[PDB]
Design a protein around this ligand. Structure first.
Ligand SMILES: [Mg+2]
Ligand SMILES: [Mg+2]
Ligand SMILES: [Mg+2]
Lengths: 127, 101, 117, 94, 197
RNA sequence: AAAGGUGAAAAGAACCCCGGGAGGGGAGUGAAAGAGAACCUGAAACCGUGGACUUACAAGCAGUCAUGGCACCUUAUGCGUGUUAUGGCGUGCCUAUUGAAGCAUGAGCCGGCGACUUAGACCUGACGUGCGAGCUUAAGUUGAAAAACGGAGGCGGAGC
RNA sequence: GUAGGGGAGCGUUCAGUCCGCGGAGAAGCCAUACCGGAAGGAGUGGUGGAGCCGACUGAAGUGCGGAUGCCGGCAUGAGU
């Protein structure tokens, strides 16, 4: 224990099987669709389903998924063939407001959103 | 060192009745001051006017302001005060500093 | 001197906001609405006490005679009877006696007929 | 009931309106109205015979309840705290 | 009737305000004093006018929701400060007899408690202050109480650059505040202290 | 127009992993990265992930009172906290009105800004203080980490 | 009990004074089944990383849901 301040130093705080693509120029709502088929499974499948799934959000999710893997494995010395998407999700980063002209003088703002795709891989096992 | 906010420059209270809190219009959840229409954010419906008896009432008299004398009552002299001397001075200190008139 | 509202308002708000719990949608997440819900809330709260009193005596009277009539009486009668016997004077717990202790309840039943005709 | 119990039972600690006799042990006696000391069903007056003896356990301040009133359009909103005092009394009587 | 401490010891002299010191009046006092020290400084473009902004906006009607004048008014961020503060004075002349009854009633205060006089302080010697502290000791001034020293004598005062203790004060140009401000009064100079009118 | 804030000090991240990059994970510096440069705190609306209790004969201002079920019990196992089922009861808020759930006005939601004040030796009254049949100063003067001086003048004092 | 009048108080900043508090940790934030007749207050824990409670008195740009209010952020319509 000690007290907060000593803890901060006795510990460093880490993130097992975790990666995160911050600021992917896509709509969270759009990416979620893909991140959703991949939630909770054989990180192999995830690799596989992405290769085929038609949505263009797939690349980024791909990249984050193979980065979270290249961590669980390296910085975490994990056993890859027991790895599975423990958790994944999409949060919205800033928003690229941009102005668009409209009929008869009026104007409009197109919201070009963006997303933080983060995915957490973890060794499975039954027991 | 026990505990004691001390008495003195801080223990110097007001007086009670000395000075009451102001008035911010909002007494209970339900303030929306002044009538309830026909009056606000302005100032002219005054309190005088010249038709409300003022006018209509007859007069021209005539103002003068001649001379105004300094009434020096009798008891001022008699009763007490041992002829402290009227003259045209002492009376002052005696009390009747009117000057001018 | 200037004098913001800072922290003074957030709090006033959290107070209400936190009163609303299982308040459905907006009503439990938006100040204005949540608050407003609590005015009608006043109406019910207050008037419901002066009122569950009304509701409860009803539950009591309902049972008191589904036992009363379980022998051949009925609240109306039954009650005036125990009445006929100043002796008897429960009325409060009477139902319960009629719900849990049948042995007893009968007693009071017949007791009234025996002070009735 | 409307103050000071009655009925049968076995002696439990129940809460009622304040009893005035403070302290504790304050041996309290309640007339009686009905009861079965031995399954003996006993009605009014014929029960007055028997009685109950309970001791004042403690004095309490109920659970704070807020009394709020409200009428619409006419403004009118009323907030006021409240909580009723009592007396704990361990039953034990005849 | 306070016994002098340096170079003599008369005392007795001086009628003191009845009944026994009255905050109310000492309050009526102190307050007034501060009001006077209260300077007038109101940084505020109260004026919807004193702020920078045009004067005609959009369209009274038909623009779809609005109805505005300039963009410089109580209700507009960056507008002007309605009923805001402007410079002023909050200085009034408290009747003289009270300013009198004032410290008078404040001296009492100090007499009834921890009063203290002194006729000259050959006990000083130069500025030093070191020795000024010295005297204090055997003078009862441990260093645990706020001391106010009224007295002319240029060179004497010159000894008081020490905190919490004392606070200097010229030609009996005393003041109900200070006195009531610090603990013990070192009335000193029997100057303003004995003989008036 | 809007626009502030790494750290005490750059010691501002060598080297390795996934990526074209962006980004991130380790390592290392640092008291701290539960300070990393889209760097003090970081509320609310608003989006989302996981968990708990629920929901696919139901008519609902959205709650409230009552009871049962389930879960949990750091101001808290003896009272409760959360959630929920069924029952009763129940016509948003404000404004403007003779009369509003009102098919009458206003308002998407939150945060912050946002409205009875200031001045005049002005008038009038309540309360309080000082003097009191008397009561006061204004301008200025000289001192000021202080306030005294200053009666020009004003108000009581006779009315018609 | 509506307009209105009268009474007692809660809170916010700033100022004077008293008692203090703080890097083994302030303010602010966040959670809570306690306290007070209300406005409101406290305890405990988490966050935070430097200033800060309580008390008496004084001054206030002092308390908000409404104004097709103002500025900013984010929603709905809709992945249309
Ligand atoms: Mg400005
Ligand atoms: Mg209309
Ligand atoms: Mg609004």
């Amino acid at each position: 224990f000690r007290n907060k301040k000593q803890r901060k130093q006795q510990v460093k705080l880490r993130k097992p099987g975790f990666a995160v693509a911050k600021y992917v120029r896509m709509s969270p709502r759009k990416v979620r669709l893909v991140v959703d088929v991949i939630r909770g499974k054989s990180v192999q499948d995830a690799e596989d389903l992405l290769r085929f799934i038609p949505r263009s959000a797939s690349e980024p999710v791909a990249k984050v998924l193979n980065s979270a893997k290249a961590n669980a494995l390296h910085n975490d010395e994990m056993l890859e063939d027991r790895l599975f998407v423990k958790e994944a999700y999409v949060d919205a980063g800033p928003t690229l407001k941009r102005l668009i002209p409209r009929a008869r003088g009026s104007a409009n703002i197109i919201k070009k959103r963006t997303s933080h795709i983060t995915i957490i891989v973890a060794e499975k096992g039954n027991k | 060192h026990d505990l004691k906010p001390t008495p003195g420059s801080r223990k110097d209270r007001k007086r009670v009745g000395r000075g009451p809190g102001g008035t911010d219009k909002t007494a209970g959840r339900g303030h929306k001051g002044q009538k309830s229409r026909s009056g606000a954010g302005k100032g002219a419906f005054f309190e005088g006017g010249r038709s409300r008896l003022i006018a209509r009432l007859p007069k021209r008299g005539f103002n003068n302001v001649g001379t105004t004398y300094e009434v020096v009552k009798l008891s001022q002299l008699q009763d007490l005060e041992d002829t402290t001397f009227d003259r045209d001075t002492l009376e002052a200190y005696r009390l009747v500093r009117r000057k001018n008139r | 001197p200037r004098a913001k509202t800072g922290i003074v308002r957030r709090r006033r708000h959290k107070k209400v906001l936190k009163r609303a719990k299982g308040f459905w949608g907006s009503r439990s997440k938006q100040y204005r609405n949540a608050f407003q819900t609590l005015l009608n809330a006043a109406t019910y709260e207050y008037r419901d006490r002066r009122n569950k009193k009304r509701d409860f005596r009803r539950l009591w009277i309902q049972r008191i005679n589904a036992g009363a009539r379980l022998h051949g009486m009925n609240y109306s009668t039954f009650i005036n009877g125990l009445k006929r016997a100043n002796i008897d004077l429960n009325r409060k717990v009477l139902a319960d006696i009629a719900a849990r202790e049948p042995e007893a309840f009968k007693a009071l039943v017949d007791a009234s007929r025996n002070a009735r005709q | 009931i409307q103050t000071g119990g009655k009925q049968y039972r076995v002696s439990e600690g129940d809460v009622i309106r304040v009893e005035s006799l403070q302290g504790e042990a304050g041996d309290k006696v309640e007339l009686k109205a009905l009861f079965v000391g031995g399954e003996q069903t006993v009605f009014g007056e014929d029960a007055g015979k028997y009685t109950v003896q309970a001791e004042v356990v403690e004095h309490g301040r109920g659970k704070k309840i807020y009394i709020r009133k409200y009428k619409s359009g006419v403004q009118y909103r009323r907030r006021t705290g409240h909580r009723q005092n009592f007396t704990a009394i361990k039953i034990l009587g005849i | 009737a306070q016994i002098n401490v340096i170079g003599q010891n008369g005392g007795r002299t001086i009628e003191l305000p009845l009944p026994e010191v009255n905050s109310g009046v000492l309050h009526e006092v102190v307050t007034w004093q501060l009001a006077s020290r209260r300077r007038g400084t109101a940084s505020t473009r109260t004026r919807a006018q004193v702020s920078k902004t045009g004067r005609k906006m959009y369209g009274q009607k038909g623009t779809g929701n609005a109805r505005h004048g300039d963009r410089s008014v109580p209700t507009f961020v960056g507008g002007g400060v309605a009923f805001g503060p402007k410079p002023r004075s909050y200085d009034y002349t408290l009747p003289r007899q009270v300013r009198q009854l004032g410290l008078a009633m404040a001296i009492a205060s100090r007499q009834e408690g921890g009063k203290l006089v002194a006729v000259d302080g050959f006990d000083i010697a130069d500025a030093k202050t070191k020795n000024f502290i010295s005297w204090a000791k055997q003078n009862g001034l441990d260093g645990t109480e706020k001391v106010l020293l009224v007295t002319d004598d240029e060179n004497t005062r010159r000894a008081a650059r020490n905190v919490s203790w004392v606070s200097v004060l010229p030609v009996a140009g005393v003041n109900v505040y200070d006195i009531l401000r610090h603990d013990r009064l070192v009335i000193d100079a029997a100057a303003l202290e004995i003989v008036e009118e």
